[PDB]
């Protein structure tokens, strides 16, 4: 064939820390369908938000929002525990259907997104250029976030994993260091603050 319908930009959702996780890659031929399981960031999360995005940037915020919806009723469980199946399906007329289903509870929500939504030709052309120009920074952003999300989880298990020795003072002190590093944007400072936390958590 010399011509074909593709979806012109990557489509995905926003994941923990403000990142775009892609479900359908740009220039994928339509119709097409892909699913991916996600879970919860923290303990006892009963409600998740599915925020649909079109674009190539690693920062969710830099992509074109296509819509969103909530999925509630999830049994409050430990992080990583819920299995939220996310499905993106683009039919031959270009209509996008997005659904999220929590496997344990059976709770499902969905949204339908008109084919005309999203960025236009010139917009699409900018998006690709701006993504390739910023490839280096988006990648360092994506690492930052992976490092932050680890730091974050470490803060939450270290607080739960607290009679411990009368020395745990320096831990509560190393927690404040880490909580502060996680707010900045220097991947290495965050890991260093984690390293300091491991080294005073030996008695734990």
């Amino acid at each position: 064939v010399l011509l074909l319908d593709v979806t012109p930009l990557s489509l995905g959702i926003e994941t923990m820390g403000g990142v775009m996780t892609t479900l359908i890659a740009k220039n994928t031929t339509i119709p097409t369908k892909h699913s991916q399981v996600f879970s919860t960031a923290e303990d006892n999360q009963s409600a998740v938000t599915i925020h649909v995005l079109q674009g190539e940037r690693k920062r969710a915020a830099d992509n074109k929002s296509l819509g969103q919806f909530n999925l509630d009723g999830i049994n409050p469980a430990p992080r990583g525990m819920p299995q939220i199946e996310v499905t993106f399906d683009i039919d031959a007329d270009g209509i996008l259907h997005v659904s999220a289903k929590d496997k344990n509870s059976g709770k499902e929500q969905k949204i339908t997104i008109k084919a005309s939504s999203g960025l236009n030709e010139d917009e699409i052309q900018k998006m690709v250029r701006d993504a390739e120009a910023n490839a280096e920074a988006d990648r360092k952003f994506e690492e930052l976030v992976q490092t932050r999300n680890q730091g974050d989880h470490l803060l939450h298990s270290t607080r739960k994993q607290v009679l411990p020795a009368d020395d745990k003072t320096a831990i509560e002190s190393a927690l404040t260091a880490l909580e502060t590093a996680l707010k900045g944007e220097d991947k290495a400072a965050i890991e260093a603050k984690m390293q300091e936390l491991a080294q005073v958590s030996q008695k734990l």
């Binding site: 926003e14 994941t15 923990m16 996600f38 879970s39 919860t40 960031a41 998740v48 599915i50 939220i84």
Partner: peptide, 8 residues
């Protein structure tokens, strides 16, 4: 391994 949705 599964990525995480935003949290509250």
């Amino acid at each position: 391994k599964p990525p995480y949705l935003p949290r509250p």
